[PDB]
Design a protein around this nucleic acid. Structure first.
Ligand SMILES: [Mg+2]
Ligand SMILES: [Mg+2]
Ligand SMILES: [Mg+2]
Ligand SMILES: [Mg+2]
Ligand SMILES: [Mg+2]
Ligand SMILES: [Mg+2]
Ligand SMILES: [Mg+2]
Ligand SMILES: [Mg+2]
Ligand SMILES: [Mg+2]
Ligand SMILES: [Mg+2]
Ligand SMILES: [Mg+2]
Ligand SMILES: [Mg+2]
Ligand SMILES: [Mg+2]
Ligand SMILES: [Mg+2]
Ligand SMILES: [Mg+2]
Ligand SMILES: [Mg+2]
Ligand SMILES: [Mg+2]
Lengths: 98, 76, 169, 183, 172, 90
RNA sequence: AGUACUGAUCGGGGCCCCGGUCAAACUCCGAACCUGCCAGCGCCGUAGAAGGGGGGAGGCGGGGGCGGUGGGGUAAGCCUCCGCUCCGAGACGGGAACAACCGAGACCGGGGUUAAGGCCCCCAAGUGCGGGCUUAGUGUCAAUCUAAAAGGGCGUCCCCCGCCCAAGACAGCCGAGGCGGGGGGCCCCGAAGAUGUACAGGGACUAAGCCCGCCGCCGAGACCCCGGCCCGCGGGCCGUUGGCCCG
RNA sequence: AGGAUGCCCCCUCCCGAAGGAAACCCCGGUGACGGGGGAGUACGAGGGAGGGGGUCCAGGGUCUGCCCUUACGUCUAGAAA
């Protein structure tokens, strides 16, 4: 039977947490202020799944283009196609590697 | 000609102490490699020589080695 | 039952989650530990013999049971139940399947050949690795010849080559 | 004169027979020594079983000391793992260093081919002197790190130490010119 | 600062059926034909490439005298023309031996000048201008042991150490 | 059958010293013996040799096992084989 | 890997503790490995990278080897996925023949050297070198390709361990070694088919077989060289819907 | 209608790419063989010059010897089938 494609269709491992990470996450990711040109890493937080980007963007590095209210507009790539991810900071981490 | 006592063991878990008659330690080791390789299908890398020592004919254990020491002629 | 060569080799993943398997067969081995099992009396025994697998493969439940019967009967007769401890060390967790046309086993089983080929349960087997202990015996050194004979009889019932290792406890 | 030729290794196939040939054509009478069980050549001096009290007899009796150091010396100098286990230095290192230093002290002739010059350089016996070595990057660096002046000639003699780049690429005339030189 | 050892790399196995990742690395190393040979500086990034192609090449530390002979016999300049002593002297290198020693010893970090290198006036270039960055060798006289086995177990592939110079002399 | 015995004069039939004469001076095992030219005499160095690579002649001298070259050379005089050794067969 | 969550499971001891057996639809841990950004290396690129527009398609049946115990299946030259390579659309050397196994990529002619593989004859090059084993013509240098298991054998070669013998051991006074166990190599039995011989190329071979090593040689269209030809790109000359020259 | 200023043989001479020996002397190895010298020599595709001798050469028909070699067109993953 063909693969089904719901928005979260092969995400058991990705959305699972170890026992020591159970419960609410810390709030420091909320407090980073990103400006255009900043580099961020998409690190999905499973306790806020409805605002999380698609599983294909986990671990990708994007560039902040701007803000939309409280979300950040991030320019990234899936293979060769440019993608625009709009997401809240709880699903973002600063990329220190350049 | 001397009797060389060769102590060794193999990667296959086999241990051996043999007495080999040769001119020099190199000749005695060549006999050990070829005979063990023939009789137990052991590659040279699988054989680990641990100790080579001259043993005097009076104290040797092998009658083969003793008899070779006193040979006066050979036949082919 | 098919010849045991049909299920000897490990050809796929283990099939053990009985909550997803319909009609998984019940284990037909009544006991796994024979002789004197209490830990206090086992302290008298000072020798250990093991029937060790030489290859990887699957041992069917009925072969384990046949091996258990012949060895335990021999030890009971010649050594005595108070003088040995025998343990069948592996459990047949893996479920075997067969693709045969059958009635009263589901509608898909009525389609012939390789259509809908996933088999219905046919038995159980233990998946073993080289060096794995199949049978484990604790005994007194006076009975060494009898224990070796019992394990030789057990080995003749098993689908893979084995070897007997005797060591002190 | 008599020369002692220590055959440490034979992995360099033609090193020992060529070195012995040059020394014989140079008027020396060559005695062969072996310190390991893996060397296949005939020898008359067994440095493996020769007692240490017999060493002073050895220094007196020989006028030259030549080292057929193949790839065993090369990978010992570099402190690098060889691609073959047989290229490991399986000889008594302390005795070998003792032989070289003692022969050097009595101002006897030392022939150091290929990577042997770097081994002599690491012993501090060529500080400020002119020497050649097998001209690979790492061996040239070791000579320079030990305050040795590298020279790009095939055979270089520094007053008792003859060093050659590679005995297998050395002509008889070049070697004999350095043997007959003054030091 | 650091002067890495200089290695000679020879492609021993052929083009058809070479796996894709090995074929790509050989192309970047300029070993695009069988029995082609290059000299590389052994920086860690380069050594990672040689490890990838270990089963298709043989390599080792090249000596200055061997490099001098390779340049004189198999060195080519633009137009596939022979490299001559006169061409070296026009550029300020006195001999094949001097430039080979300069490269092996680390005085210069490249043997063939880069594509975008621009020759100055009077100044000796730190390389040989317009030398082709690869050598096309002859098959080895007397043959090899086996192009399918590693040198460490009696074949010819992989790291050879200083014995690469013995092999090169047979391939000149 | 081929018989090799200590003291027998032999001819080497393989190697660079092929056609030269030599004297057996010791037995290593059933397959190898030690021969000496003497070198100064026939050009054969004192080395072990495989039995397959020598052929016995009809001449024999009397020596002890592991006899030195000088002892061999002296015994080559009591028998008068000195010019016999310098001759190269084939 | 673990049996700690969810489950399975054999024992011991007092619902707990200890030991043991397991998991595609279990996971505290956790590689090799793959992958994102940046910097460098390497290579490609102004003789034109990225990107974009336009015309014409063919094709939308694939197949072989190897790897994921991929998953299924008694198995299949079987079905269905994932990846590198090759055939299709690829000459040529080797494999006895043989699309896809090994070697290797072919403009034409010639010289040379190697690759795989081979060197008793067929058949170019060794009746090549040292050691050991086999007596069954066993066997006769990977795969396609023509085979073999559980089990039995001191048949024979060899390695290790335990015990006896201090010459009062084993076998029926004699005088020197003896008894048992575990393992390894080769071979023997286990081994039964249909047109035509010890089939797996044939002759035949006691090595021309097998094991541990070694030396040289032969051998492609590959690699090197010479001559001839053609091509792509760039430059130049000529009154040019084109021609010629150079790199 | 092609060459006959040809072709062929011998000899001599010159140059010569890649490649490249041997006898023999010396060093090593049990040995098959390796190395230094002899020697980048003798030779070597081919390119040049001359002399002596001969008579057709090229081309074609057919036959023999040695080496190589699985009709064509077609659909097809796969054609001598
Ligand atoms: Mg789909
Ligand atoms: Mg909602
Ligand atoms: Mg399977
Ligand atoms: Mg291939
Ligand atoms: Mg487990
Ligand atoms: Mg993956
Ligand atoms: Mg389709
Ligand atoms: Mg496929
Ligand atoms: Mg088609
Ligand atoms: Mg073929
Ligand atoms: Mg022939
Ligand atoms: Mg079977
Ligand atoms: Mg047969
Ligand atoms: Mg005419
Ligand atoms: Mg059809
Ligand atoms: Mg069809
Ligand atoms: Mg057809």
């Amino acid at each position: 039977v063909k693969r089904t494609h719901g928005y979260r269709y092969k995400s058991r491992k990705l959305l699972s947490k170890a026992p020591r990470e159970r419960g609410m996450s810390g709030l420091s990711r909320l407090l980073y202020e990103y400006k255009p040109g900043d580099k961020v890493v998409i690190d999905i937080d499973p306790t806020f799944i409805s605002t999380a980007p698609h599983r294909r963007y986990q671990g990708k590095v994007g560039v902040v283009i701007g803000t939309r209210g409280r979300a950040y507009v991030i320019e990234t790539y899936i293979g060769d196609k440019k993608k625009i991810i709009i997401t809240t900071p709880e699903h973002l981490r600063p990329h220190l590697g350049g | 000609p001397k009797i060389y006592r060769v102590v060794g063991d193999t990667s296959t878990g086999m241990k051996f102490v043999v007495e080999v008659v040769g001119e020099r330690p190199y000749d005695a080791l060549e006999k050990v490699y070829s005979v063990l390789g023939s009789r137990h299908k052991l590659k040279r890398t699988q054989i680990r020589i641990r100790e080579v020592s001259v043993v005097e004919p009076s104290s040797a254990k092998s009658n083969e080695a003793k008899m070779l020491m006193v040979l006066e002629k050979v036949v082919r | 039952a098919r010849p045991a060569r049909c299920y000897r080799r490990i050809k796929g993943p283990p099939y053990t989650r009985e909550e997803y398997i319909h009609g998984a067969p019940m284990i037909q081995i009544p006991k796994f530990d024979m002789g004197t099992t209490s830990a206090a009396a086992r302290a008298a025994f000072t020798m250990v013999a093991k029937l060790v697998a030489e290859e990887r493969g699957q041992i069917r439940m009925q072969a384990l049971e046949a091996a258990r019967q012949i060895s335990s009967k021999y030890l009971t007769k010649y050594v005595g139940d108070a003088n040995y401890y025998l343990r069948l060390n592996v459990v047949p967790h893996h479920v075997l399947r067969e693709n045969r046309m059958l009635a009263m086993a589901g509608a898909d089983r009525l389609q012939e050949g390789m259509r809908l080929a996933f088999g219905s349960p046919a038995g159980r087997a233990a998946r073993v690795e080289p060096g794995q202990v199949i049978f484990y015996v604790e005994f007194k050194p006076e009975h060494l010849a009898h224990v070796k004979e019992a394990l030789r009889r057990a080995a003749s019932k098993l689908p893979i080559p084995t070897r007997i290792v005797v060591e002190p406890k | 004169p008599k020369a002692l030729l220590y055959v440490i290794d034979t992995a360099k196939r033609d090193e020992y027979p060529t070195l012995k040939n040059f020394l014989v054509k140079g008027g020396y009478e060559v005695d062969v020594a072996v310190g390991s069980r893996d060397v296949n050549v005939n020898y008359t001096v067994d440095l493996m079983t020769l007692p240490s009290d017999k060493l002073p007899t050895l220094f007196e009796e020989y006028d030259a000391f030549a080292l057929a150091g193949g790839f065993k010396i090369y990978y010992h100098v570099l402190q690098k793992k060889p691609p073959l286990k047989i290229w490991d230095l399986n000889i008594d290192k302390e005795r070998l260093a003792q032989l070289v230093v003692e022969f050097n002290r009595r101002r006897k002739l030392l022939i150091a081919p290929m990577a042997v010059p770097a081994y002599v350089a690491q012993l501090g016996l060529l500080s400020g002197r002119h020497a050649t070595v097998y001209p690979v990057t790492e061996l040239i660096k070791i000579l320079r790190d030990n305050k040795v002046n590298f020279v790009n000639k095939q055979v270089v003699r520094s007053e008792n130490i003859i060093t050659v780049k590679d005995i297998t690429t050395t002509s008889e005339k070049e070697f004999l010119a350095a043997l007959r030189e003054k030091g | 600062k650091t002067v890495y050892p200089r290695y000679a790399v020879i492609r021993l196995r052929g083009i058809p059926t070479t796996p894709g990742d090995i074929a790509a690395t050989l192309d970047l190393l300029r070993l695009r034909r069988k029995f082609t040979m290059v000299v590389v500086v052994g920086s860690p990034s380069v050594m990672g490439m040689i490890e990838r192609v270990n089963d298709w090449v043989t390599w080792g530390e090249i000596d200055a005298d061997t490099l001098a002979e390779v340049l004189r016999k198999r060195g080519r300049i633009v137009g596939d023309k022979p490299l001559t002593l006169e061409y070296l002297q026009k550029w300020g290198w006195n001999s094949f031996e001097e430039v080979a020693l300069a490269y092996i010893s680390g005085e210069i970090e490249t043997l063939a000048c880069k594509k975008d290198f621009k020759a100055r006036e009077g100044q000796r270039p730190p390389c040989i201008p317009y030398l082709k960055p690869f050598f096309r060798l002859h098959p080895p006289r007397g043959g090899l042991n086996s192009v399918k086995l590693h040198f460490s177990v009696g074949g010819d592939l992989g790291y050879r150490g200083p014995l690469i110079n013995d092999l090169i002399k047979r391939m000149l | 059958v081929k018989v090799i015995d200590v003291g027998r004069v032999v001819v080497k039939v393989l190697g660079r010293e092929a056609g030269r004469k030599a004297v057996v001076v010791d037995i290593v095992d059933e397959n190898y013996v030690v021969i000496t030219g003497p070198k100064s005499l026939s050009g054969v160095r004192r080395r072990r040799v495989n039995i397959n690579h020598i052929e016995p002649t009809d001449k024999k001298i009397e020596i002890k096992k592991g006899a030195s070259d000088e002892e061999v050379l002296k015994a080559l005089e009591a028998a008068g084989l000195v010019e016999y050794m310098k001759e190269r067969v084939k």
